[PDB]
Amino acid sequence: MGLFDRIKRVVSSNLNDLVNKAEDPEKMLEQAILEMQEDLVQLRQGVAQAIA
Amino acid sequence: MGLFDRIKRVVSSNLNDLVNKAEDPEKMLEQAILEMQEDLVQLRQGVAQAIAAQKRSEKQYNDAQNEINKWQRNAQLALQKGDENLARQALERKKTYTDTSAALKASLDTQSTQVETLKRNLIQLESKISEAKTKKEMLKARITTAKAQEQLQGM
Amino acid sequence: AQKRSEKQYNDAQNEINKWQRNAQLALQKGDENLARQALERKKTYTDTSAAL
Amino acid sequence: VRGMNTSSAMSAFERMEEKVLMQESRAQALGELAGADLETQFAQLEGGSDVD
Amino acid sequence: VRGMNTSSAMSAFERMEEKVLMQESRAQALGELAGADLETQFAQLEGGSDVD
Amino acid sequence: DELAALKAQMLP
């Protein structure tokens, strides 16, 4: 029972540390921008295959 | 007897030390919000699978009906042909399929009711998470003011 | 935080107005189902706005 | 012809089962989006406009 | 539905209640201290009279 | 009740 309580505290501490460290508006958006474009390309390839 | 009582006291003391470290609301709240959404997604995925399973069952049921129709056509063809043997095979296939279809339909109806109940539950769950999200902003505002007061109090 | 809350409150009012427009549209449409969804949304939002 | 435990026959059956299951899974996710009133309402508005 | 301690919803509510009560109490205590210092309050009243 | 209100609005 004690371990479960400890895990929640550890998770909360880890989560709090994690959000602050990785929260950059410019960096996150750029990565996201690259990802959506890549996804679109994959979709386009599938469409091309269907066309083929 | 004494040892058991002592263990409970030790556990309580240990619990008190642990909660204080994780007492702050913001770290716990953010984790909880992430967790409920994940739980909802898992529930949704399970529901989707169940819905897909029902669709597959319906497709199978539809296929069985089509199969029965095909068998019926063969039976009709057999009569035109005049061969008794062809007709006999078709009849046996129709009876087993009908029984299977009836069982599937009954199962589907029970499943459908459960899905409808699940959908209603999902909507309620969706409403609850939104309310929680709104609460954090309200919680944040009061907390910030309290922190400011402590600094003011010292002066 | 207060400004954000005010913005959220303003957004909620705008959201309610949008919902009201949909409800008005539903009456013109003549479909009962569209109207029902709008009404539920308005009540919860009003309570939240009052609390805020 | 047999549809026996042959290597080619087994693969086709498994593949057939997977695609059908995938389509059903996709439909269920799609259905939730479809269920919402706003999506349905937009289509109705478009149809009236198209007729005019 | 169970709303057990392990579930996230139950945990959030208990922590929030303790924090909210404690925060409010601290603010109230600060106000009480201000009330105790009558001279400071008197000075503000004098300033208001001067402004008038 | 909402349905009844909607119905009332609909008649004019």
Author numbering:
A (entry chain E): 1 to 52
B (entry chain D): 1 to 155
C (entry chain SB): 53 to 104
D (entry chain Q), E (entry chain J): 156 to 207
F (entry chain P): 208 to 219
Paper quotes:
Reconstructions were also generated for the other six symmetries and complete ring models built. Rungs are maximally constricted at the top and bottom with internal lumen diameters of 14 nm and 15.7 nm, and widest at the ring equator between rungs 3 and 4 with an internal diameter of 17.5 nm. This unique asymmetric curvature is a feature of all Vipp1C11–C17 ring symmetries. The analysis of different ring symmetries, ranging from C11–C17, provides us with a view of the structural flexibility that enables Vipp1, PspA, and ESCRT-III family members to perform their functions. Furthermore, as each ring comprises between 5–7 rungs stacked together to build a dome-shaped architecture, these asymmetric structures provide us with a glimpse of the structural features that enable filament tilt in the context of an ESCRT-III-like polymer. Based on the Vipp1C11–C17 models, where helix α5C is positioned at the tip of the spike, α6 helices likely coat the ring outside surface and do not contribute directly to polymer formation. Consistent with this, Interfaces 1 and 3 linking the top two rungs were poorly resolved in Vipp1C11–C17 rings, indicating a weak interaction once the limiting geometry is reached. When membrane was modeled into the Vipp1C11–C17 structures as a 4-nm bilayer, sequential constriction was observed with the membrane lumen reaching ∼3 nm within Vipp1C11.
Proteins that perform these functions include Vipp1/IM30 in photosynthetic plastids, PspA in bacteria, and ESCRT-III in eukaryotes. Here, using a combination of evolutionary and structural analyses, we show that these protein families are homologous and share a common ancient evolutionary origin that likely predates the last universal common ancestor. This homology is evident in cryo-electron microscopy structures of Vipp1 rings from the cyanobacterium Nostoc punctiforme presented over a range of symmetries. Rings have an inner lumen that is able to bind and deform membranes.
